[PDB]
């Protein structure tokens, strides 16, 4: 604590003087919706497989 309390900088008004990173007002950005139907595995199947089991 004696470290902490003594520390300048890390006090409050200092945080208040700094302007707030643009990443605070940011959007979540949603990161890949429009690829959702397309299968990214690239394997797919074969009518011989789709047939035996079903």
């Amino acid at each position: 604590n004696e470290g902490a309390i003594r520390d300048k900088t890390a006090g409050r008004r200092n945080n208040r003087s700094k302007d707030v990173t643009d990443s605070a007002t940011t959007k979540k950005s949603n990161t890949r919706r429009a690829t959702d139907r397309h299968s990214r595995t690239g394997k797919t199947d074969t009518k011989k497989k789709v047939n035996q089991g079903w």
């Binding site: 604590n1 004696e2 902490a4 309390i5 890390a10 006090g11 409050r12 008004r13």
Partner: protein, 145 residues
């Protein structure tokens, strides 16, 4: 029916405990302007002081003002119990006080300085200016100042 006139007997803006009380209001509420007296303490004070509470503060002859004051700074001796008192079982001194007027600001700082000298986590939070009790600081208390 208290309907009454007087002449010079009513006086607006008198002064006690280094503060200016409103000369127009009821005395229980006129006194609460003093730091350290709330509605419950001013109310009990007028009661031990043989003061008719139906009066405005602009009534209350100087005698009666002197009674309110002595009682105010000696509550423990007027049958006012210890649990009615804002600073109890002090820390150092150890006795039952009721602090008033500009001393409330003082003793408050003393306490604050105390655990700040001791560097307990609570004074740390005071020093920074953060919330002292256990609340979440994430969403609330913005706009600061």
């Amino acid at each position: 029916s208290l309907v009454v006139q007087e002449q010079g007997s009513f006086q607006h803006i008198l002064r006690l405990l280094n503060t200016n009380v409103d000369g127009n209001i009821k005395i229980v509420y006129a006194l609460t302007t003093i730091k350290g007296v709330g509605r419950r303490y001013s109310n009990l004070v007028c009661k031990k002081a043989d003061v008719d509470l139906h009066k405005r503060a602009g009534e209350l002859t100087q005698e009666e003002l002197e009674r309110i004051v002595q009682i105010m700074q000696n509550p423990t001796h007027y049958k006012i119990p210890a649990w009615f008192l804002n600073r109890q079982n002090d820390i150092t001194d150890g006795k039952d006080y009721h602090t008033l007027a500009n001393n409330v600001e003082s003793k408050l700082r003393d306490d604050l300085e105390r655990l700040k000298k001791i560097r307990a986590h609570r004074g740390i939070r005071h020093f920074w200016g953060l919330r002292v009790r256990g609340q979440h600081t994430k969403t609330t208390g913005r706009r600061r100042a």
